[PDB]
Amino acid sequence: AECSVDIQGNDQMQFNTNAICVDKSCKQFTVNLSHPGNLPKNVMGHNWVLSTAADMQGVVTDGMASGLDKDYLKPDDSRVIAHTKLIGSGEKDSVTFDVSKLKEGEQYMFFCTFPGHSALMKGTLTLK
Amino acid sequence: AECSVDIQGNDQMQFNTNAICVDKSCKQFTVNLSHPGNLPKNVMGHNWVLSTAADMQGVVTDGMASGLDKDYLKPDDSRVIAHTKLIGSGEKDSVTFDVSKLKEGEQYMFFCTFPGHSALMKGTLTLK
Amino acid sequence: AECSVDIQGNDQMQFNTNAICVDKSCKQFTVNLSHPGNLPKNVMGHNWVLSTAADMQGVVTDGMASGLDKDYLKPDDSRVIAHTKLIGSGEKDSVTFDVSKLKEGEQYMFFCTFPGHSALMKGTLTLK
Amino acid sequence: AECSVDIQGNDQMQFNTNAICVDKSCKQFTVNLSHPGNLPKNVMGHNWVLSTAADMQGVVTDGMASGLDKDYLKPDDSRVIAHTKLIGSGEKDSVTFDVSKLKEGEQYMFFCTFPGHSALMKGTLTLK
Ligand SMILES: [Cu+2]
Ligand SMILES: [Cu+2]
Ligand SMILES: [Cu+2]
Ligand SMILES: [Cu+2]
């Protein structure tokens, strides 16, 4: 509640939120991702990935090419501020990151990088 | 155009887009597939195949079992909403299908069924 | 040199030889596999896998089902006499196996089990 | 028997002849190929392919690369004087060719172009 959000990615290619605001007074912020539904990771895998709005396209593009065994993320992608693993239905993953990595006024996007998902599974993140 | 999309599958085993939007005010939608590159068709052949997300795995698995002879598609597969032929380098093929075949509340995936290709060659199709 | 062979699998989905001879007077035989080219493992990965001709199809079918994370080989597959790891471009791997595992009168095939690859990446191994 | 020969290719990668002599008084010559054994075409396919000795390596190499659905022969290969289709166990095929295509004094080879078989399955053909 204070410094975390719980997010679900389902079999209908939806996150159950499209907007996050991180309280600047949190030292760290945590996203707890889960995957209701029944489809497997190779058909309906979801991650939660954070970048600047400007970097989203390249993160998604390079991620899609990286393949499932790399969680559809380019390894060591410096544009990725934080991310969960790619999960299938019934799996879960959390990611915690340092709030100092964000700056007020900058535009951030969160999204899933499974091929074709970012067009449907994305939202804004703000720091206040 | 308003009722079609151009898509490329290349010799890096990628499509050049992974998300398609079909405008519900179209009667029909056309996918124009092309194949930049130069590898033989029996090495890097591509098609564009559409099914629901729930059906994708079966279409791909049965498709590979069907062999090159059958363009890696199970003949008269009822799960396949639309598909192009399998093409090699420098070739083109288009498929047109009725938008009435889609519903606003369903999840669709497009993909190549050549063995192993769907690892990267897959994406979403959404009716809006 | 008398008890080993160097073999390459390339970006054209070919091995650079399709017939290997194993000298009966060798106690052990070594295959040194390399991968000229530049495609990544998840597009054009190769291994070198040995079975009887009669087991080849079953090994290839089950290997495909096993996934890239298993190097496209069924775990503990009793039909695989010997195998390298799966490698991408610029990588190499060797396997050594006891020549006593080969029997006179039997027919052997080597092949890559990456999806679709065995179509062209297959060959014979003969004990002399 | 004066203008034909029956040849078997078995599960042991052997033809049952290593040498053919075509009587030049024949207008045409026929090879009747059969495949004793149990193994199917995809792991133990055999064809009977005729070229000059000088052309054999290129025919075999390009044949390999062409795949099972092309009977492991390059389409319209001008170096191929005559060929059967590729057969598996229990199957049969015959080819007839004009004897005028052959020159007395020239060296010819017959062989199977299934990957790795030509090293084991080849012989000479002479016109007299
Ligand atoms: Cu997703
Ligand atoms: Cu493809
Ligand atoms: Cu391979
Ligand atoms: Cu053969």
Residue numbers in the entry:
A (entry chain D), B (entry chain C), C (entry chain A), D (entry chain B): 1 to 128
Text of the article:
Due to the crystal-packing environment in the triclinic crystals, the label is observed in two different but fully ordered states. Following initial refinement with omitted R1 side chain, models of the label could be unambiguously placed into the electron density in all four monomers, resulting in two distinct conformations of the label. Henceforth, the R1 conformation found in monomers I and III will be referred to as R1-I/III. For this R1 conformation (from here on referred to as R1-II/IV) PISA calculates a solvent accessible surface area of 260 Å2, 171 Å2 of which are buried. In monomers II and IV, the crystal-packing environment precludes the R1-I/III conformation due to steric constraints. Comparison with the rotamer library reveals that χ2, χ4 and to a lesser extend χ5 of R1-II/IV adjust to values that are less favorable for the free label.
Thus, the problem arises, that on the one hand, the PELDOR experiment delivers an accurate distance between the two spin centres, but on the other hand, the exact position of the distance vector with respect to the protein is unknown. We present here the high-resolution (1.5 Å) structure of azurin from Pseudomonas aeruginosa PAO1 spin labelled with MTSSL at position T21.
